[PDB]
Amino acid sequence: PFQACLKVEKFGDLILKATEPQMVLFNLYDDWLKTISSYTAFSRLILILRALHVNNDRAKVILKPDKTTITEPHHIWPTLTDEEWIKVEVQLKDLILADYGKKNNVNVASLTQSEIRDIILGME
Amino acid sequence: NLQAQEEEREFYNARRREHRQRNDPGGNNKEKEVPAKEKPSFELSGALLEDTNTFRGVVIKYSEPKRWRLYPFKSAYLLGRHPIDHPSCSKQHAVFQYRLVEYTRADRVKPYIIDLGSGNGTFLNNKRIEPQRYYELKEKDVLKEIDDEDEEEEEEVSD
Amino acid sequence: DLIFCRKQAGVAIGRLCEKCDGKCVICDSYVRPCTLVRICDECNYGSYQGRCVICGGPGVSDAYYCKECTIQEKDRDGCPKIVNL
Amino acid sequence: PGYHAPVADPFAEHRPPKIADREDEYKKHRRTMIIS
Amino acid sequence: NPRTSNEVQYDQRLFNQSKGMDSGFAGGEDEIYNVYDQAWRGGKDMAQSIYRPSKNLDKDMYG
Amino acid sequence: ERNRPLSDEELDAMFPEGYKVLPPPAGYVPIRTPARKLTATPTPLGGMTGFHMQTEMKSVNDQPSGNLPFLKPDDIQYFDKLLVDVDESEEQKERKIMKLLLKIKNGTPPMRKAALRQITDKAREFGAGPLFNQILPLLMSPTLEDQERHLLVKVIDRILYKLDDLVRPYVHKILVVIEPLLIDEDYYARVEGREIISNLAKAAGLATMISTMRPDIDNMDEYVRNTTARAFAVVASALGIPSLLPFLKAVCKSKKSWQARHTGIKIVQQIAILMGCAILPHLRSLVEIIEHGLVDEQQKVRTISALAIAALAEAATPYGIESFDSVLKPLWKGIRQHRGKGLAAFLKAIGYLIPLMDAEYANYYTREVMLILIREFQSPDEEMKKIVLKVVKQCCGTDGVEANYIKTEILPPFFKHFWQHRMALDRRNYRQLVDTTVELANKVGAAEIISRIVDDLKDEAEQYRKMVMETIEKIMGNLGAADIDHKLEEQLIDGILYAFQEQTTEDSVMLNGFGTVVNALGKRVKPYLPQICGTVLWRLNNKSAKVRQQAADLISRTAVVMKTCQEEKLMGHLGVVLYEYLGEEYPEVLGSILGALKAIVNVIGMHKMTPPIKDLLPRLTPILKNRHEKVQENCIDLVGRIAD
Amino acid sequence: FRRTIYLAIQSSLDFEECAHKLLKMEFPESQTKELCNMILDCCAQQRTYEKFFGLLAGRFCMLKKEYMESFEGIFKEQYDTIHRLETNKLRNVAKMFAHLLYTDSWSVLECIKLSEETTTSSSRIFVKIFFQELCEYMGLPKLNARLKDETLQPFFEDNPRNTRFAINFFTSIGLGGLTDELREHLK
Amino acid sequence: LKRQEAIAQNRRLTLEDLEDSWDRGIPRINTLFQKDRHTLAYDKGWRVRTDFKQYQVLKQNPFWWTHQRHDGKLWNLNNYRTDMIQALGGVEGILEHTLFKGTYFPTWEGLF
């Protein structure tokens, strides 16, 4: 879901405000690579994008739970700790799976681990 | 259309509540949160028995001005008729619960007298106080409302 | 403290657990399993179905008598399911 | 110090690891039984 | 009858956190290590299991 | 209560022999009388204590002689007589020498042994009187240990193998302490207690026991009544039912008060539990006793009565149906009109009865019970749920019941109300639930039950997962996996792996569960292997001591399945991979590893071993030093298989 | 740049060495705001007050005229976060500015105000400490001087009410020996 | 002061009002809340016994001056490790010197 990445306020605003064709850079991992591996940060990324793609604002509820949670200007996503990251990850997996099963009328406690991994990661 | 239902309800205290929560009978005047004995408050004052503050009692039989005994107050004491009441009194006018004397903490360890609403009352310096409020006592003050067979005085230990 | 019940021997097959599995009951020996154990359902019933004849665990096998106790004909007495006293 | 004294059993930890009381309030009437 | 005590004293959540007595840390042996109080990462720190699935909480809180 | 004032005869009642009452003055006595008034008065008066600095004989007693192993600070009260060293001047010397008890209680194990024998052979000498006089206080001690208790129980046994006619005066004086052993949390304590009361009753006379134990029947406290009932159970096992019958049959008809009849009926019950299968001959007379309590005006008597019928029938497993005969018609009637616990009790009785009836009469009667059984699923009472549970087992596990009727009426409410996280956390409810569900599977078939409970393998809590897991285990154990379709089988294998991947404790249930599932599926499992064994290797690392042993054992039990389907690469894997762990320093792991190797040897043969034996065996040889157990076990086993 | 600063500072004993290490590197100057912003944040964020991180900020000022300016700015930048910062780090700050201001890296204060109108209970504590430290050095007499020549107003006035808040508040701090003249003014 | 305010409020103090100073002070205030605190209240002269342990025991104690049970832990080096890894170039750069890519582990986040 690289498309939903432009649902973020910053990107869409930037593009809509842009007066000339121009190349811009960003780091979607922020400072994550300090505490984690690349690929794992990649999984966290896919979780975030997909989750923004399904319920949108509700994923923003997960990502902006407490007003005491802040995001720094250098970074795309709020500053969180590893415990906090595992929790919000579980919540995002919950968003994606719940809505998929709600569309396909499937009891989503009955899906497999392979099925869940597929659904989250992409097309099965 | 006199009494629609014969029972209805209450929303009221139960005798076993107040009973079990205070028993010597059940008593009144549960100590407030402040109450603390006077000796340990003389320990936080850093005072050995020489310079410590101890309240001694003095008795005078109201008809004849001395000691039947002398009484230390050193957190509270139950002044009553005699068995339940700790500070028993032979006075026949005292209700089964007459009054209480509680040392409390304000700003300091200070003595306090509180009437329980004894039917006759109680006189302070031959001047009564109304029921249901803590009234600080100062040294040399006197206790006996009008039924008074006795007198009492308070003294701090000094000299 | 521990002795035989010696109730009449029925048609029910004996059941030994993991521990007791190989032992011939009376001779306490592992040698020459030949004949088969019988105890009364009075001794073997219910929670005792497939119970050990000894310790009280689930029977994983069936006890076989030795040839020693065979010729001395001890296997024909009362049901040799040990009862604690 | 008096403040740390205001801040003022392990044998009863290890010793209680030996045996136990084990029992309820219903059973303790045992203690009230006089001999015959 | 309230249950009252002089002063207030202290709560509970903390009033029993750290071990007891225990004593320092060996005579002062070299072999001990023990310099750091917490582990490096949250891999084993963060949870007993990194992954558990379910929608139980999901389809319950969902509505 | 215990603070009630006392009298001088009552005062002379407590303390033992040889003490004097003193007045010092009449005046100090008047101080003691004013003391009450002065406990208030002189506490409110001048007082204090101080000390002066001055320079400074110290007597004391442990138990000296030669050795005398140590005395706890309390036990002094008992053993004080031993402390004084006055010696060598009759009975007082027998009590004095009887402190060998102290050697039994506290000391080294050898002192306890030798002491125990020495007091055994002195039984006939000292007599039961002095012993029990010096024992029963100890076994009555409030501070008593576990071990010390058990040991005093031992000495009571060993001395009661000898003394026979002697104990007659002390029988009650014994039982009062011993009856609390019958009701206890410890099991071994209970079997001991039953044993020593057996030895006592058989040791004493019948009339001794009977005439002894009457006044405890009407005793105010129900505790003594209950434990006394179990006592009569034990003594009745000793001296047989028919000898004691007329006593009972006299008791249950006592017209004084109900409490008695309640006791006697409870006695009938505990006889039912204890004697069990052996009740059979006198079943008729027993029933004829108990029947008159079902109609009694008091409630308890009715409840405990019908309960006792239950216990009977449960030990009556099928026989003697007509002996219960006259009991039925009231019971069924009561089934209509009752609210509360008594109802459930009746359901318990009837429940154990139904397997004993004829499938025709029990057809009708059963079909009547099913209604109330349905309606009553929902009660919050856990006693209720136990009863109605076991009931559903017996009623619906009847050969004369139709599947479809259960499938419709029962299963949906059954899995609704009964399968919840209140149940599984409890023990008995756990087991009984397992059994009942197993039997429902035994009738309606497999795919139904399993198919409904599979989704719960993935539930959060352990104990619940453990429950459904062992349930699936027993089910697929009995019915066989043949009934299972395809998709539900995918949910199966995934469920079992998933549940197996999170193990908080080490236990067999998950493992035996998996093994039974696979061995039952046969070669329908083949498409699932690579997922299995992938999990098996990755788990085969993880964090060591917890899961290595478990994944290893998983291999061990999955060997044959990994063989017959002819996946040889997998045997290469397990062969050399497991071969590599033989250097593991943790014994509890290594043992499981060797076990896995063993199981792999029993499937693939000698000359086909991917780790050729030339490699393997000498690599095994040095391990024999390994001390800790499991290693030695599995190791020696494998050296045995290959060496043979 | 932000990471290099930290490593250079965590490496060096003394406060002297970090500046030498830092200047030596010859990192770009304009950043000479944020760098110093780095030092103020890096230790203040650091758990407890330490003498080192406060000295460093100051020297870095005497060496170049701008560095001083860079600091005074950063002190301003506090207003926004006077409320916001949590109530430990105020314990590092109050003193930590105390040590720039006792040693002359005072009138920059004046910007700070006493009002129930707008002062953050945060800010309340912040300034509170700041005096209970700086006092402990100058000893409340030299402080008498520095104030008496200061002309600090938003602190020291109109607003007899705010003179109760002021003077009272310095009875609360406890110093309240530089509140005299204002007491007279009340009268 | 936190004790006095708690007294006047009659409400006892929680953890949070002490979260500020939790690790601070020479007695290391948190040491009041040690579970075994009773026992330690009856220990005296510990500091000198540590001085004379050098004679009773062969090994040489550098920490002789203090004891964590009475005085708490007077330092926390947890930062030093993080800053150390940062100065070396982060986790990955360090691993580039190792066999790690040999072990074929997916990640280092689970290295134990």
Next chain:
Amino acid sequence: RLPPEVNRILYIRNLPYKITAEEMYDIFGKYGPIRQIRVGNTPETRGTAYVVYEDIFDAKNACDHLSGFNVCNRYLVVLYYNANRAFQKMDTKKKEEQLKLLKEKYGI
């Protein structure tokens, strides 16, 4: 707020053979009125005594403060005395007269 095992009776030991009941009554008389006190006059029990008070909490404050308390050169052994044990030396009887009295006087 009391342990159940403690009773109004206290066994007291480490007494001299000369000791006077005057000292006994005086000392022990602090905590409450004496129900009574016994003292072993017999060869083994000499040096031991039993104290009984009108109230238990009396004895509780006693063993509290009197724990290991001193007399002469000695630190007395202060324990809460047991129950039951040797009792039946006396009997249960003589209830009939008193119960007949309470059934007579108050009529209940």
Next chain:
Amino acid sequence: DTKLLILALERLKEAYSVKSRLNQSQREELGLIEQAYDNPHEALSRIKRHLLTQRAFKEVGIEFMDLYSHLVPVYDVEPLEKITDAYLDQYLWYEADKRRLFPPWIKPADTE
């Protein structure tokens, strides 16, 4: 008493805390101290019995720890007398501090 005995026993256990296979005498010491945990009142009575009676003890081993400058004496006692003496020490310091024996100017002090 239990408090004191516990403290002293922990102190003794602290020398061996790293615990390699040690040796025979040390083994006796661990087993005997371990014994003291299970049956404390026994140990206390035995100790007080020693303190009231025995005036003759066994021989103490001696060895020198080498600081490369000045050697440090090191003494070795049989475990029994070590537990006895240890409790004696915790007790002495406890009573001492309670009674304010040592004036403040003696400062290898617990406070600081």
Next chain:
Amino acid sequence: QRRKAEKDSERDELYAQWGKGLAQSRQQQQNVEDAMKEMQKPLARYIDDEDLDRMLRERPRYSGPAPPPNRFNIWPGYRWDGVDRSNGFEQKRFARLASKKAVEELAYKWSVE
């Protein structure tokens, strides 16, 4: 029969909404407000106004004494008796959970050796 069947039925609304947990329902309500925040505040960071005042401050209810801590931190009602009546499982449950936290750390200390 309209008003009567709406007495019983609108009582099904009343006691239905009351049944669960009136306290629980309001907390759920707050989340609904949160959705409103999302529509205007798609990805809020820092100084944006709600955060501003947010960090710009840092129906009888029971008065007397204090209410012992409750895992869920709920002040007792208006007229509450003012006395602790409990099995103490909260504290011990409260204390034990805390003890484990100490246990995880002293578990670790083990690992380096």
Next chain:
Amino acid sequence: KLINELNEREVQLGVADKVSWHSEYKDSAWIFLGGLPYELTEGDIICVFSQYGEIVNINLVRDKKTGKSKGFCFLCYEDQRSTILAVDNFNGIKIKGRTIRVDHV
């Protein structure tokens, strides 16, 4: 009485929260207090059980004719966590000599 032993198997085994059997319900405030003393009344039990919450409405079962309590009450709080707290806490309590029982509904 069985409750407290279920909470001990729940704490001993390390159940860790949401799998708790108070999550059995999630739908229900009303609690069941049985084995209550007959002298008790509305205002009383309200005053004791408003400790752990705010009780909205309680119907105590009192026999219709005689107009005295049958000995138990169904209560309703404003908050569920008050119910979880109350069942898990206030149970096994002494009142007037008799130990009350509580549980969900």
